[model samples]
Target chain A: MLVKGNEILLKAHKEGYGVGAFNFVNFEMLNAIFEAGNEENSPLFIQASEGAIKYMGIDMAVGMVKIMCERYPHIPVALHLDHGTTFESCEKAVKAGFTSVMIDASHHAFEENLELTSKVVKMAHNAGVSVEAELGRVLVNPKEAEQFVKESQVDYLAPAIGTSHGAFKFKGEPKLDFERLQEVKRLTNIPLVLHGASAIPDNVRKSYLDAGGDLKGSKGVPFEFLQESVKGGINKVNTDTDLRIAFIAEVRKVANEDKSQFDLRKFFSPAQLALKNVVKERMKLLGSANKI
Target chain B: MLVKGNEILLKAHKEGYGVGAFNFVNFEMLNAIFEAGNEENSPLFIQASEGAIKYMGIDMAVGMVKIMCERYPHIPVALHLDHGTTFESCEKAVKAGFTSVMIDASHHAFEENLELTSKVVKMAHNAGVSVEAELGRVLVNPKEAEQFVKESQVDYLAPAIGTSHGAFKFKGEPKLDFERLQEVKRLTNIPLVLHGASAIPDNVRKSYLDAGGDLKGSKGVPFEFLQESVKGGINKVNTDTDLRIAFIAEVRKVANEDKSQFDLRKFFSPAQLALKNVVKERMKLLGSANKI
Candidate 1:
């Protein structure tokens, strides 16, 4: 039951809901993702960042996800590459059986981004792989988005809406350009993606800081904005920080609260459960529950 | 290349060295083990306990190992099941492509152990998989040892060598019966296996305690004892606790010292390297290095 990214995005767009794309670094995190997806009977977009791909071998990461998808055939699973920085990386992922790849050439100039994305889109689409491209920043010009989609033929476009990667994402009140999102959606008429969509709630952040964490100014996009973004035409949302925070928070709490507990499962099982709860909650918020 | 357990044991016995068998719970530990084995040019016995099989789905564990073995063809790898308590578990492991399995029916009566081991030997051997069975206590009678081998025809025998399973293995000096090990080797004429071979160094234990680990009475078989056991005819030395301690200790240190660091690889890379160093050190201690 591994499906392409375009299929997932198209279905979500038609159904008027959003799909949650979560990044996994290892088997335990993958286990947590599968647990939540199976429990919710939801379609899931499981991805591995280039950093994660380097941490866990490409074959090992992709192989385990395939087995997980096979183990639970009822759930629609997409093996995606999150923030594929280079065309070579995207090609490697496609060769490794990835269902989709996101080419993050947003760091480059617009002309360079267009050329690289068009090349990736051609290569990925030729191999039956779906492509996602990102614009430079959140304030995307409608004409540019429409032109990029027209020339690149990307199935999904991730317009950077000012949410930075990792923790402490914002210096001020987190602001998202819903109007920009709508214009891009209206002009491109394709599935829109929102990266760095982790809703790092105050309670989770406090728990982390309380448990000997030094997370100063670690802010994230608010939950309400995430839902509103979906309503504004974001069919796919990528989340990594929240799960990492949840996992780290639980592990730190166990270590801080009880220094004598050495059994790893005893320490990690709780964290895994916490991670599952986060995914489940995100899936619900994305309106992906029972979508299988 | 995945080799049969009996072949590895026989070669190790003939070569007069012991192979370092490490247990892994997830892909991260598995990655560490493989990295050490490949870098050291050593043969490896990578095993998963029943707990690990349940923690990471069986398909996921086996699939990742298969990919790694295929990834590095120069290294000799054996996918094994550690302390399989039931015949059904062993069967599942074989079906999942394990090269070997250890059926721990040592707790059963003599006749029951004979029947179970014999049955497992037949099934595993039929599939070109090797089987290892344990004798309940260290002081196994010579006659029982000979009879068990004759009846069960197991590839390897793990006699309870007084090195109990986990941490804090002994209150006094960990004394192993070399005479008993010699007798079993003489009668069985097969390679001997030693479980609980972790040489939990004082520094590692202290580090764990410093990191808030509750391992007050935790002890393991000493290195001198491990080397002497190898001299006495043990071919495969299983070490889990030391690596576990090493991994947990490093993770705790990083988490304790740097609360602001959320990147997992930033925390786990050090731990992985530590585990690799431990494995490389153990392989050298067991005289398995440079044998591949």
Candidate 2:
């Protein structure tokens, strides 16, 4: 009953299954994550980024997820804030009843990041809420934005290595900085996080690109590859871009097939299914199948 | 002053003016409405549609608006529901602490509409809330859905004549249904309403469109015409589409002129101005100007 992201994530890593952390933009996206988690019987993480919270209205988003959690009490669900960039954003999330939140001080200097993360730690712990902090820089692209965490003293950190966000993460091959990953894990007691760890297969990429699309040099960490990372102490693996790519590709395909589509309710279902597939695949790959 | 939509609307009609029922979707929108209303010294209606309520998340939206009302204690602010289609929606709005609501059973038959309106009235009255009902089918455009109001014997019966929603009323020319309007007023003791009465001046549309783009047939109700309609006992009017178009046009001009400009703060000012212009114009046209 007292489920937390850190506990669930570490357990999932040990069991060889990764917890699905799906970012929900609206009710439709929330439903997709729920359906996928239910079908797989896998523990899930439904996160809302600050941008998403702003898009759908933060209070509404939280209210909607709270309803979902109440409706399906059996499923292990942690309402999380992904990349809460500001102190206000974090404060709002905590005030809005989010059980877990990531204070993204990754954009700040090492000392600044430490001070900010520690501040959040104290605030969150007081409210019985769990806090996450990212270490190092998550480059906009894998080939670039790579920075290593020079041995530092931080209470908690979710360091980013070579994980770029979104499907268009790179124009070339993406190489994971396992050296930086190990350094961060060795430095902090906080759980290690691997952001942008989508194992989008080459064939899936080709299939989408072949269908009048230009997804050139698109790449993500494979499932087998991610499993190895988890074994090496990456407890929390973010899997948002994968779901987005999967959902949008299918939606585009549907629109291509049916040009006269007007009913949003009709087309949204297929994308939801696409999201389900991505989540299911992540659960199966991370070995989280039936873990819930 | 004890102000309700029914009473305020009737007063606007008898005084030969219209009241601005600004749709509040979020804090920013709500803030803008109140700020403008205070500046104009005007009586304002902050109404949320079923979709807006669903977007704002009921309890929080109501709570925030209530706080805002407390802040601006001098302004007569009525927190209202724009178009609540279902009983569940109405009940939720009432529970959320809305002051007034429009039970929009326009999609149903006359008797069904009356029954549903009456039921909502009972619930709203029980909560000491006011209820508004719809009466006619408003013609929709090529890109818009034609929203209708079923005939009701309840408080306010808003009939949709050939006059539709948004700035572009008709594809060809503008026309008014004074005859249908007179009949609806004769039938209902409750103050009558004219739905979709935003007057989109040709100058406002052409100024932006001619700057770079071609807006073939973009239209709205003329302010002079709306002024006349208000004198004829047409009080409450909806004006969402016009504000949307104006805001988008202003923002688009900025973006198209400069592709490298990515700052949102810079963009918000123009959007705020566009919305202010629409509200100010409506206030003046409705003859509700300086009435607050």
Candidate 3:
């Protein structure tokens, strides 16, 4: 049965488990996340941001994911656009066979955001492609999730909370507006999404910093915080940097120790493991264990 | 009219006309280069470096180019790997459907480079893929090309003349060892390649720098230098940084003027043009007019 993201995502929302949307830049990352999703039996949203989309070639990524879905028939898998900001980008993804897309116009004014969101909805909905939209800016306070729901009638609503993006978000303190999130949930029936929730592993950070890394004020949604957010109507968490940090850290370790670790796979192994750990931990926190 | 790259590349060597190997990252780049190739009746090499292969997904890039070739029956298109450093990378490309691949082991020692080159040849041959190998690193010394050809078994060589890569190469002075380039041509039956022959349009670069930009110490092959190189038997010229500078300049223009111009296509127009101009200019320089 072909399940649209709306029904699947909503169910996850009600259950208090945020489906993991993992961004992949290569095959290793894809395999790691896919394995984790299967082992946990959770519904997975394997996504590629616009950059990832450009890197992996639109048609190729979609085809690879579709093949994986067929290969792992027991697991529910959907390929999606993480933050499609343009019509051409979204349309290209749709034509390339993406099952879901997020038109992130949150950075625009409410009316501008609404116009952009509605335009994508019209194009995608007509083709039976599911749409995801953001109402207010993710990095802003007083997240207007309600406005997002009213304006962008998407299958899912990802609103801005106190939690911003990248490691710098938690440099000051790990803050997220549960009140804002809850209000968005009450006003809309669609699943709520929390973008930029990749937990930066403590050991991973320390390892880099230990090597004179001097990473000043880099922070992300801590693991415990994400679990707590799941209970507050955040049913989807987008992760990209978590994997990036982990991968680079592992490669750095190899490079520092061995001068001849020139083979790509030699460095790629640890990077792959770092990404896998992220998906595994998120699966457990989101309560998506064995749900596949 | 499906043509094989092995035959086409061989013809390029025999006839002393360089094939324009356009590196494509998206649909427009692919379509534009192919269009230019068709318009000029020139044999085109749709090529990608490892970075591009990583970004566009190897299978997807190859398949997209194949579709274009099928659509335009008038032009001969060869899917190629522009600068593959390892057997593993080249093998993956061949398996994914690229007709030809350049095993760029130039940075390695001659013995190691030859071993690696021969290994790629066997693997690519087994997969029914044509192989192109680089001899010496590309630079601004003509004798450098001669030295490499005498010492290496390069199926296709990109001898470094005084020309280094990007605009920075000419930051001091423009020089080429064409006399030595002729020596390499006399030495090898393989096609000669000019790795960094993109003419950095001085006017465009100047405007970019004039507008509070800071891209100092940049230089590329002058227009006449590239023409002379091609006439001397250089058959393939790689264009990346040249296009990139133009792309970044245009993108910066949009962002600096309209802080909210984020609809990707608005920025992509100049990028596409950057690629198109480089191809058109090189095509004309190589005397590839009506050579299909």
CA-lDDT, candidates in order: 0.85, 0.63, 0.68
Docking level of model 2: incorrect
lDDT of 3 by residue, B1-292 (tens): 3355667768877877877677765455676687678767787877787876665567557756766666577787778887887888888888778888888776676667677877887788777777776554434344544455445434566666656653223455657777777777776656777776667778657645543345554556677887788877788777665655554455445444543232344544665675566677667777676887
DockQ of each: 0.71, 0.06, 0.04
Tens digits of per-residue lDDT for model 3 on A174-288?
A: 5777776676677776787887665777876775555334444456667877877787888888877666666555555554454322233455567667778878877777787
TM-score of 2: 0.66
Candidate with maximal lDDT:
1
Candidate 3 CAPRI level = incorrect
Identify the runs in model 1 with alpha carbons over 4 angstroms from their true place.
A162-171, B165-171
Q: Which one wins on DockQ?
A: 1
* Residue-by-residue lDDT tens digits, candidate 2, A1-292: 2256666765754454456577876655677787788888888778888877775567667666666665468888877889887777888888888878888776667568767777777777677777777655343222212222222322234555666643224445556667655555554434566776767766556445543444444466666668766665676677776666665555445435643332233444675787777778777776677887
- What DockQ was computed for model 1? 0.71
Instruction: Write the residue-wise lDDT of candidate 1 on A1-292 in tens digits.
Output: 6889999999998777999999999877898999999999899899899999988888888888888878888889898999898999999999999999999888777899999999999999999999999885435677888999999999999886656643224455657788878888889999999876668877778768887787665677788989999999999998888888888888888877776665568768988898898899999999999998
The clash count for each model shown is 6, 15, 22
Error of 3 at B181 (Å): 3.7
Give the interface RMSD of each candidate: 1.5, 8.7, 11.2
Q: Write the per-residue lDDT of candidate 2 for residues B235-278, one digit (tens) a residue.
A: 67776656655554554455455433323333345756767777
Candidate 1 to native Cα RMSD, angstroms: 2.3
